[PDB]
Design a protein around this ligand. Structure first.
Ligand SMILES: CCCCN1C(=O)/C(=C/c2ccc(O)cc2)SC1=S
Ligand SMILES: CCCCN1C(=O)/C(=C\c2ccc(O)cc2)SC1=S
Ligand SMILES: [Mn+2]
Ligand SMILES: [Mn+2]
Ligand SMILES: [Mn+2]
Ligand SMILES: [Mn+2]
Lengths: 331, 321
């Protein structure tokens, strides 16, 4: 058969796969017990790809930090990124909003790749782009990247806030000039995020969720590790990461999002669970004989990674990280 | 299909600034003009395949944003004319191999041959073209071996390419990035380690051998037809007498190949020779550079005391030796 897009007359539906924050190349807990997350991460990524093919999505949205290293990604990480980029392109057209990166050639290569393929689009600026989905649907993309060049704002918090609002207003005006569907893609922190620990060694951009253009069919956000349904109109979702990067994500549910849009109907979405390895933190005052029993008993049949937090040294501690290959951190 | 029209250009050196030690000159504007002329000629002749070899970027490992932009720009302009096959030169960046394979996988109008493995490509009119790539042996940029085991390694791959070239469909094209042994009128290595290959070891069973890495055009041999196209601009005064451009190659199954040189007409260079720099010499130098639309070098033999600031009063004079 053929392997290009279909063209269905008068089709007013759009199936979306939105995944985010892969962090390809991460090794966790380097200061205590380094753990290469690649195998677990590739397992989760395969699960998301398989779900995209089964549901026959029309469009794949990629946000957040797909690479863990901001400026020196390894060859293996780059290989995995390009590998999984191709695996999605074979399924449906891909739109990528690259996260916070420094390299200045990356925009040129992103524009080059976009120019030579009709199945992947890199949105590297604030300018809107019209793309074509798997079944011919015309989709207008409203991108809100991290304001590059001025990673140092070079201005007070008052002109900057008005600059961001002006960009959001322009995106609103461009979203009104839409054909079929319109999707917002943003790389920032929604104002007053509930249960959001804080910036993980980085400068954060804060945007009020009401400033997201209401006339878009979906708002695809990234940069935060935890899934969050920010609002319903417009439906605004952070998908979260695919693995639990650190123990702050112990209680998180990890995966991607399947969004279905229908003209005339309200949008609906399902969470695609990647079911990565679990995390557990064990708390003790001192590591006494009672604590040693609780640690060894829990870790023995726990299929994930364990952290132990204690207050005071009570003598010499046994080689717990030797008898327990599951124990990755004792502070 | 039993015909194949080829545009072969090489060694663009995008991003070069000439004569940095004396009077830097950004060659970008001149180079883009020459590149535009080659692109236009590819469209006019309606080539079926475009071959890119040599140093498309002047900087081996730190190309500027402007240079990278121009490279990707003219890559796209070539892809719009006919399918492109690129033999990238010696580079350090390790992502280059992954990105090259990625771009090749996602577009059916460009192919980056990043290894010794043969690749089959399809030309504009459906011609099946087998590419026999001979890149600079990466990893071992330091040979890590004597000249005897290394030479046998290279010969083994040329033999392998010969055997793979025999298993061809329509046409077979060799692409190599090396220096042919005993090049006639070849100054020498321009600040680099050279790999030397005897031209008789180029597999004779290919329809065309597209070479690069040399600034000056060379017809190495006719069976198999082996050509360096040369650079598109005169990078330095050693190329003063060179004619610069690309090569248009026409192949016909069963017939001998023929080629035409496509003149890019870049700026001319001129070297002025004097015994000593006397007052008559300054007048002649200033008068010549005033009406010369290119770049001028002055070399003189005898110390002539202090000479006026010729490189200040003459924006045309780029080098005094
Ligand atoms: C798929 C692109 C194919 C063409 N192409 C490049 O993108 C290159 C890039 C490069 C980048 C950094 C550096 O330090 C040296 C080279 S070289 C080359 S050919
Ligand atoms: C999150 C989307 C990322 C998309 N993306 C890259 O980041 C690429 C290459 C790269 C190379 C060197 C470096 O330091 C950083 C990046 S190529 C490509 S597509
Ligand atoms: Mn981020
Ligand atoms: Mn993140
Ligand atoms: Mn070279
Ligand atoms: Mn060269």
């Amino acid at each position: 058969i053929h392997h290009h897009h279909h063209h269905v007359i008068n089709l007013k539906e759009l199936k979306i796969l939105h995944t985010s924050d892969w962090h390809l190349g991460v090794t966790s807990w380097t200061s205590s017990r380094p753990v290469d997350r690649r195998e677990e991460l590739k397992k989760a990524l395969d699960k998301v790809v398989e779900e995209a093919e089964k549901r026959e999505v029309d469009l794949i949205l990629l946000t957040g930090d797909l690479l863990h290293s901001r400026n020196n990604p390894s060859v293996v990480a780059l290989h995995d990124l390009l590998d999984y980029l191709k695996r999605m392109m074979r399924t449906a057209p891909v739109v990528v909003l690259p996260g916070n990166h420094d390299w200045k050639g990356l925009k040129l290569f992103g524009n080059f790749v976009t120019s030579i393929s009709s199945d992947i689009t890199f949105v590297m600026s604030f300018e809107p782009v019209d793309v074509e989905a798997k079944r011919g649907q015309k989709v207008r993309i409203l991108p809100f990247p991290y304001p590059d060049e001025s990673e140092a704002l070079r201005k007070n918090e008052g002109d900057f806030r008005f600059f961001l609002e002006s960009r959001l207003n322009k995106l609103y005006e461009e979203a009104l000039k839409k054909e079929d569907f319109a999707i917002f893609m943003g790389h920032f922190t929604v104002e007053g995020l509930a249960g959001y620990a804080g910036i993980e060694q980085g400068r954060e951009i804060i945007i009020n969720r009401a400033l997201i253009p209401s006339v878009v069919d979906y708002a695809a956000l990234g940069h935060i590790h935890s899934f969050r349904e920010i609002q319903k109109q417009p439906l605004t979702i952070y998908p979260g990461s695919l693995i639990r990067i650190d123990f702050g994500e112990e209680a998180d549910e990890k995966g991607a999002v399947f969004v279905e849009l229908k003209r005339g109907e309200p949008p609906r979405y399902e969470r695609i669970d990647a079911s990565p390895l679990p995390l557990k933190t064990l708390y003790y005052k001192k590591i006494d004989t009672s604590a040693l029993k609780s640690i060894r008993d829990f870790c023995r049949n726990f299929p994930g990674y364990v952290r132990v937090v204690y207050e005071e040294d009570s003598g010499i501690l046994p080689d717990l990280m030797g008898e327990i290959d599951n124990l990755v951190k004792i502070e």
